[PDB]
Design a protein around this ligand. Structure first.
Ligand SMILES: *[C@@H]1O[C@H](CO)[C@@H](O[C@@H]2O[C@H](CO)[C@@H](O[C@@H]3O[C@H](CO)[C@@H](O)[C@H](O)[C@@H]3O)[C@H](O)[C@H]2NC(C)=O)[C@H](O)[C@H]1NC(C)=O
Ligand SMILES: *[C@@H]1O[C@H](CO)[C@@H](O[C@@H]2O[C@H](CO)[C@@H](O[C@@H]3O[C@H](CO)[C@@H](O)[C@H](O)[C@@H]3O)[C@H](O)[C@H]2NC(C)=O)[C@H](O)[C@H]1NC(C)=O
Ligand SMILES: *[C@@H]1O[C@H](CO)[C@@H](O[C@@H]2O[C@H](CO)[C@@H](O[C@@H]3O[C@H](CO)[C@@H](O)[C@H](O)[C@@H]3O)[C@H](O)[C@H]2NC(C)=O)[C@H](O)[C@H]1NC(C)=O
Ligand SMILES: *[C@@H]1O[C@H](CO)[C@@H](O)[C@H](O)[C@H]1NC(C)=O
Ligand SMILES: *[C@@H]1O[C@H](CO)[C@@H](O)[C@H](O)[C@H]1NC(C)=O
Ligand SMILES: *[C@@H]1O[C@H](CO)[C@@H](O)[C@H](O)[C@H]1NC(C)=O
Ligand SMILES: *[C@@H]1O[C@H](CO)[C@@H](O)[C@H](O)[C@H]1NC(C)=O
Ligand SMILES: *[C@@H]1O[C@H](CO)[C@@H](O)[C@H](O)[C@H]1NC(C)=O
Ligand SMILES: *[C@@H]1O[C@H](CO)[C@@H](O)[C@H](O)[C@H]1NC(C)=O
Lengths: 316, 167, 167, 316, 167, 316
C-alpha cells in the first residue's frame, strides 16, 4: 500500500557539542562561542592615536627630551610602549599608577604657565642626563639652585590659582642629592623643607641626600609628586631648596583610552577591544585570548572553546 | 523500502530540515517542508541575536604589564579578577550546555509537531507504522501526496474507501 | 462554527485559563476547567515565590559621593563594581528569558495534558478534527457534555451507537 | 454532529516579553522584575536616626561647634550631608575614609576622659575659626601652647590605658603653623617631634610649618591622626610642641548603618535599602535606580526593565 | 485490578525505573524495561559528571585572621568577597532548581516515550484505558506479553481476531 | 480481557527538592550539592610541610630565636599559627601583609651573605628580649652601635649587588630608642638619617625616639623595611646610626601555598582545599563551611544545603 514518511535531515560529519545531560552529542551544525582569533595590530581607524614610543606617559607632564612631541599631545587612543620612560634624571613619581590611570582616559593634556619668577637664586639647573643640545633639563620644570656654590637659598613662597573650570594637574619635585657635599654646593647648608598646600590638601617633604646606585651617571634622584588643584583653588609652595619647581600646569582635554602594547598601529582596520598582543575583533560573547584585555570586550573565559549548537541532532 | 524519523535521519534531505518521503505507484519522492523548517531556523536565529551581543560596558586598565603595581593591591586585583574569571567560565559553560539541550529538544519538538499534524489531517484513512510513517489505506497518486504536504488533503473524499480497506 | 486551541485562543474565556466550548442540539457553550487552570497558576506562583525574594545580605558604603577616595583604590572599586554589574545584568536577562520560555511551554503543556486526557475518556466514540476539537459520533446533550468536563463520562454507555456511526 | 472543543484564554492587548528563542513574544500577563520606583525620602521608621546636617561625621570625635549635639550621639541609621564638615580650624584626617567607614556602622560613640593634666604649659589654645561664644576650639581636644610667647615647650610624656572590654578610638593632632615665626611664638624655637606608641602601633610626626592658602582666615593646618587602642593596651604620647592633645577617648556603642543623602527623613514609612536620592522599597530581585545603593537591596542591573511572564501565550 | 503511570507509581517495581505490569489468564506480572531505564540513568549520570567537577583554579589568602589588615582595603576585600558570595549562592540555587525541574521532566519524557512506543507496536489490536494501560482486544499469554516487552510483537498475527472483538 | 500497563517506580519517603516551579517536590532520590563536611586536620600527604608554630613567617627572614629552624626553610605547604611572632625586640614590618603574601607562595627561602664589614663602630648589639644563651639578637641582622657610649657614629655607605638570576628580598631596620638619652648613648648626638636606594627604588628614614609602652621590658622599637632587589641591580645603604643592618639577603626557592590554622597536621590523608578549621575533601561544586577557604576549592555559598535530584518524581 501507499505510505508517506515524516523525516528530518542529517549528515555524515556531525559536530560534537555538550548538553546538560550528554558530553559530545553530535548535531548537524554548530558555531563557536569563544573567540581565539586576534589581529596582531592596534586597529586604530576612526581614532586619534598617539604612539608614545620612547616617551613615558607620566613624562608628558614633566617633559624629558623623549617627550617633547607630546608636551601638549591630544588623542583618543593612547599607546604606551615597554621602552617608554618618564624620566631623564633618575627618579620616579609617587603614586605613579593612579596618575597614569588618569592620563590614559584624559584625552591628552593642554599646558598653561603658572607664572613664577625668581629673585636671588639661579633657575638654569641642568644635567648631562637630560640632554638636548648637551646638558639640559625637564622642559616643564625649573631646577632652582642657590645663586652661587654653597650659597644660601632664600626661603620663598610662590602660588598659583586655577582660574579655569576644570581641575589643574600640578606637579613638582624634590631633589635627593648624592651626598651632603652636593646638597650644600647646590642649595647651601642647613636642613631643608618643602611644604605644599592647597586647601583640600597639605603635605610636606624633606630631601634625603646620600649615596645611591649610579643611574645614567647620576647618584642623585628626583621624587616627583602631584595633585589635582581645584577650580578657583590655590596651590602654594613654601620652600628653601631641593625644589624642582613647575613652570606649567596641565589640564585634561577630554576622553581617551590608554593601552599597553608591543605591535604596530594600523589606521585601516577598525577595532574596540585591545590587548598587548593586538586587537580583538569579534562578536562572540566570550574570548580566551587575554584576561587583561580592555575596551568594549567579550568576557574573558578559561576555556579554549564552547560550541553552541545551531542545528538539530544528527542521526545518520 | 522506506523509513521515517523514529529510525533515523535522511542524509538525502538537502533543501530543508524537515520533510516528506512518499512511496506510491508512480514511485518514491522526497520534498522538504518550508514552514516547519523555517520555524526551527527562526527560533535558532533568535538565540544567536541574544548571544551574539557585544557588551556596551567599557573597561579600562587597572593594572600594569611594564611597571608592576604594589604587591598588596595587585594581589587584590589579581584575586578579584580570577573570581570574576571563574564566574564567567561557569556561566559560559552552563549557557552553552543549557542552550544546546534546548536547541536539540526544540527541533525534536518541531518534527513532533509536524507528524502529529499529518496524523490529524489523514484522520481515519491511515495507520501509524511506528518508524514515523503512515500506511495510507487507499491509493494516493503524486497529487494526493502533494495535497497532504501542502495541507489541502480532505479526508472525507477518501474515507469510505480507506475505512473499508482497514477491515 | 467552533474551533479549538490549535487555531487560536478564546478572547471569550473569562473565568479560567483553560476550558471547553461545546456545540450540540441545545446550543453552544463555554465553561472553564478548574484543576488544569489552577495547576498552571500554582506553577507560576511558585516561580514568583522563588524570584520575589529579598536578599538577606547587607552591603555598606565602600565609597564616597561627598569626599572622593584616593584615585587608585577608587578605580579598583569602580572596576570591581562594574564587573559585578555586568554579571547581574547578564544573570537577570538570562533568568527572565529562560523563565519566560519555560512559562510559555509550561502552559502549552497544560493544555496538551487536558486534551489528550479527554481523547482518552472519549475512547472510540469520537475523532480528532485537528483544530483541537473532538467530533463526537453520537448525540451528546448538555448533560453528556457536562459529564465529559467533570470526568464522569463513561464511554461504554455510548459505544455501540457511536462505533456504528463512524462506519 | 455534536462536538467538544478544548481551548485556552487570550486577549486583545498581550504584553510583549523575551524568551530564549524570541524577542517580543506576546503573553496574556507579565510582571516587572526591575525596580525603577524610588521614594524621595529616607524611610526611617523603626530606627534611631541621627541627621548630622552641618556636622561632619569625623567631626563627632573631635567636636568642632557644628557637632556639639553629637559628641556622644547614639543611632541605628546615620545620615551624612553634603554640607557636613569635620572641622573648624582647617585640616583633614589622615586615613579619613576608613575611619568614616568604622563610625558609620558603630552604633554611635560614647566618650570617656583620658585624664591628662598639664604643668608649665598653656592649655587654652583657641582660634576665631572654631567659635562658640567667640574664639574657642575643638571640644574633645586641647591646644597645648608654650607657657608664654616664644617660650620653651617642656618635653612631656602622657599615657592612657584602655581598661574597657572593647577597643578605644584615640585621636590626636599636629599643628602646621603658617610660618616658622608662628611655630616659635606658640611652642618656641628648636625642631619638634611628636611620637605615638601603643604596642600594636608605632609612628612619628614632625610639624611642617609654612605659608598655605588662607582657609577661613587661617593659613595653618591641623593634621588629625588616629588609632584603635586595644583592651588593656596603653597609648603613649611623647611630644615637645605642635601637639593637639586628646581630652577624651571614644568607644563604639553597637551596630548602625550610615548613608549619604540629599532628602528628608520620614519616620512614618519603613525602609531598608537606601541611596542618595532616597529609599527603595521593593520586593523585586533587581533595581535600575542606583548602583551604589546600600542596605539590604535588590541587585543593581543595567536595564530599565525585564518583564517576567506570568501567563501563557497570547493567540487572539 | 491494576493501573499504570497516569494514576501513580509502583512501589513494587524494584529492579528498574520503568516497566510493565500485565494481566492475563496465567496471572499478573511485573518486569522492568532495561533500555528506557538505562537511558534515564545515563542522562542523569551525565549531569553528575558536569556538576561534580572540582575547580582547577587556585586561590590564595588575601586576608588575615591573626593580624587584621588595614581597614580600608580589608573592607574592600570583604565587600568584593560578599558580592561574589551573593553571585555563587544565586547561581547554585538556580542551577539546582533548573536542573531539578529538567531532571523530573526528562524522566516523565522517558515514560512517555515508552508508552507511545508500545501503542504503536500494538497498532489496531488494543485501546488506551486512560490510566496508562492498554486493553488488548485478544488473548495474550505470558509469551505474547513477553513479545510486547522485548519489542518483537507482530500485530498482523493477531489483527483480524482483535479488530473483530473491538466491534 | 488481557491488558498491559506501563509504569515507573516509586517509594514511601521520597526526598524533597526544589524546582523552577515548586518548593519541596518529592523525588525518588537526590544527592547533596553543598559540602558541609570538614576534616579537622591539615591533610598534608604529598607535600613538604613546615609548621612554623612559635615562629612568625616574617620572622624567618630576620631570625629571632623562635625561627632558627626556619632561617632557610623549604616547603610546599606553609602553616602559620596564632602564637607565631615575627619578633623578639618589639617592632613590626612596614608593608607586612604584602611580604607575608609573597613568602607564603615562595617555596621557602635560601639565604646568602651580603658581605658587609665594619670599621670604627660596634657590631655586637644585643638585648635581653632576643635571648638564646642570654642576651642576643636577630640572627640575620647586625645591631650597629657607636664604638663606645655617647660616641660619634661614622657616616657610612655599604652596598650589595644581586648577581643571581632571581630577585633578592632585602630587609633592614630602624631603631626607635625609648628616649633621646638612649639614642645618644648608642649612636651619639646629632640627628640621624638612613637612606636606601636601589635604582628602581628610593626612600628615606629618620629615627623617632621617645617613650612608648613597655613591651617585653623594652620601650624602644624596631621598624622593619624591605624591598625586592632586581637581578644585576644594587641596593645601597647610606646611614649614620639607628640602622639595623642586614647580614644576609633572602631568595625565594619555588612555589608553595601558605595557610593559617589551629589544628594538627596529618601526612596520611591527602587534601587540597584548606581552612583554619582544617581541610575540606569533597567533589561537590559548592561548600558552606568557610568563605575564606583556600587552595583548589568548592565555591563558597550562603546555603546549608541544595539538593540536586538524581531520580524521577515520586507518586506512591
Ligand atoms: C551553520 O550555522 C552557522 C552559524 O550560525 C551558519 O553560518 C552563519 O550564517 C548566518 C545566516 O545568515 C550568517 O549571518 C550573517 O550576519 C552577519 C551580520 O553581522 C553578516 O555579516 C553575514 O553576511 C550574514 O548575514 C553568519 O555570519 C554565519 N556565521 C559564520 C560564523 O560564518 C552556517 O551557514 C550554517 N551551516 C550550514 C551548512 O547551514
Ligand atoms: C498578572 O500577574 C500579576 C502578577 O502575578 C497579578 O497581580 C498579582 O496577583 C497576586 C495574586 O493575589 C498578588 O498577591 C498579592 O500581593 C499583594 C501585595 O503584597 C497583596 O495586596 C494581595 O493581598 C496579594 O497577596 C500579587 O502581589 C500581584 N502583583 C502585583 C504587582 O500587583 C495580576 O492580577 C495578573 N493579571 C491578571 C489580568 O490576572
Ligand atoms: C541515589 O543517587 C546517589 C547519587 O547519584 C547514588 O549514589 C551514587 O551511585 C553511583 C553508582 O555508581 C556512585 O558512583 C561511584 O563513585 C564513587 C566516588 O568517586 C566510587 O567510589 C564508586 O565506586 C562509584 O564509581 C556515586 O558516587 C554514588 N554517590 C554517593 C554520594 O553515594 C545512589 O546509589 C542512588 N540511590 C539509589 C537507592 O539508587
Ligand atoms: C572664588 O570665587 C569667588 C567669587 O566668584 C571669590 O569671592 C572667592 O574668594 C574665590 N576664591 C579665592 C581663593 O579667592
Ligand atoms: C598577576 O597576574 C599576572 C598573570 O596575568 C602575573 O604575571 C603577575 O605577575 C601577577 N602579579 C602578582 C603580584 O601576583
Ligand atoms: C566612579 O564611579 C562614579 C559613578 O558610578 C563616578 O561619578 C566617579 O567619579 C567614578 N570615580 C572614578 C575615580 O573613576
Ligand atoms: C593586662 O592586665 C592584667 C590584669 O588585668 C595585668 O596583670 C597585665 O599586666 C596586663 N597584660 C599583660 C600582658 O601583662
Ligand atoms: C571581614 O570579615 C570577617 C568575617 O568574614 C570579620 O570577622 C572581619 O572582622 C571583617 N573585617 C572588617 C574590617 O570588616
Ligand atoms: C649588568 O648590567 C650593567 C648595566 O649597565 C652592565 O654594565 C653589566 O655589564 C652587567 N653585568 C652582568 C654580569 O650582566
Amino acid at each position: 500500500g501507499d505510505k508517506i514518511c515524516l523525516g528530518h535531515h542529517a549528515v555524515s560529519n556531525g559536530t560534537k557539542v555538550n548538553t546538560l545531560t550528554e558530553r559530545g552529542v553530535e548535531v548537524v551544525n554548530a558555531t563557536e562561542t569563544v573567540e581565539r582569533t586576534n589581529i596582531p595590530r592596534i586597529c586604530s581607524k576612526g581614532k586619534r592615536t598617539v604612539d608614545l614610543g620612547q616617551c613615558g606617559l607620566l613624562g608628558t607632564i614633566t617633559g624629558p627630551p623623549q617627550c617633547d612631541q607630546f608636551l601638549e599631545f591630544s588623542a583618543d587612543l593612547i599607546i604606551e610602549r615597554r621602552e617608554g620612560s618618564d624620566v631623564c634624571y633618575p627618579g620616579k613619581f609617587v603614586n605613579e599608577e593612579a596618575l597614569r590611570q588618569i592620563l590614559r582616559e584624559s584625552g591628552g593634556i593642554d599646558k598653561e604657565a603658572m607664572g613664577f619668577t625668581y629673585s636671588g637664586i639661579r633657575t638654569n639647573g641642568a644635567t648631562s642626563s637630560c640632554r638636548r643640545s648637551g646638558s639640559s633639563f625637564y622642559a616643564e620644570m625649573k631646577w632652582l639652585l642657590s645663586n652661587t656654590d654653597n650659597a644660601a637659598f632664600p626661603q620663598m613662597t610662590k602660588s598659583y590659582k586655577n582660574t579655569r573650570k576644570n581641575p589643574a594637574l600640578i606637579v613638582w619635585g624634590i631633589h635627593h642629592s648624592g651626598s651632603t657635599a652636593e646638597q650644600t654646593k647646590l642649595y647651601g647648608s642647613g636642613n631643608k623643607l618643602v611644604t605644599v598646600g592647597s586647601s583640600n590638601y597639605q603635605q610636606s617633604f624633606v630631601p634625603s641626600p646620600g649615596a645611591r646606585t649610579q643611574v645614567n651617571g647620576q647618584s642623585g634622584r628626583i621624587d616627583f609628586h602631584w595633585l589635582m588643584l581645584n577650580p578657583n583653588d590655590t596651590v602654594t609652595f613654601s620652600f628653601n631648596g631641593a625644589f624642582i619647581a613647575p613652570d606649567r600646569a596641565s589640564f585634561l582635554r577630554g576622553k581617551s583610552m590608554g593601552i599597553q602594547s608591543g605591535v604596530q598601529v594600523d589606521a585601516d582596520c577598525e577595532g574596540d577591544c585591545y590587548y598587548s598582543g593586538g586587537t580583538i575583533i569579534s562578536n562572540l560573547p566570550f574570548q580566551n585570548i587575554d584576561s587583561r584585555a580592555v575596551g568594549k570586550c567579550p568576557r574573558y573565559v578559561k576555556q579554549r572553546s564552547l560550541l553552541l549548537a545551531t542545528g538539530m541532532k544528527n542521526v545518520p | 523500502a522506506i523509513a521515517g524519523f523514529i529510525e533515523n535521519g535522511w542524509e538525502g534531505l538537502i533543501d530543508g530540515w524537515y520533510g516528506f518521503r512518499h512511496q506510491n505507484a508512480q514511485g518514491e519522492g522526497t520534498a522538504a517542508d518550508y514552514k516547519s523548517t523555517q520555524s526551527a531556523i527562526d527560533q535558532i536565529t533568535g538565540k544567536l541575536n541574544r548571544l551574539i551581543e557585544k557588551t556596551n560596558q567599557q573597561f579600562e586598565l587597572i593594572d600594569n604589564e611594564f611597571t608592576e603595581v604594589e604587591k598588596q593591591i595587585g594581589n587584590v586585583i589579581n584575586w578579584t579578577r580570577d573570581s570574576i574569571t571563574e564566574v564567567w567560565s561557569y556561566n559560559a559553560e552552563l549557557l552553552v550546555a543549557m542552550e544546546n539541550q534546548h536547541t536539540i529538544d526544540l527541533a525534536d519538538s518541531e518534527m513532533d509537531k509536524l507528524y502529529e499534524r499529518v496524523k490529524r489531517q489523514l484522520r481515519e484513512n491511515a495507520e501509524e507504522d511506528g518508524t514515523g510513517c503512515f500506511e495510507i489505506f487507499h491509493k494516493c497518486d503524486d497529487d494526493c501526496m502533494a495535497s497532504i504536504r501542502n495541507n489541502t488533503y480532505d479526508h472525507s473524499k477518501y474515507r469510505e474507501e480507506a475505512m473499508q480497506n482497514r477491515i
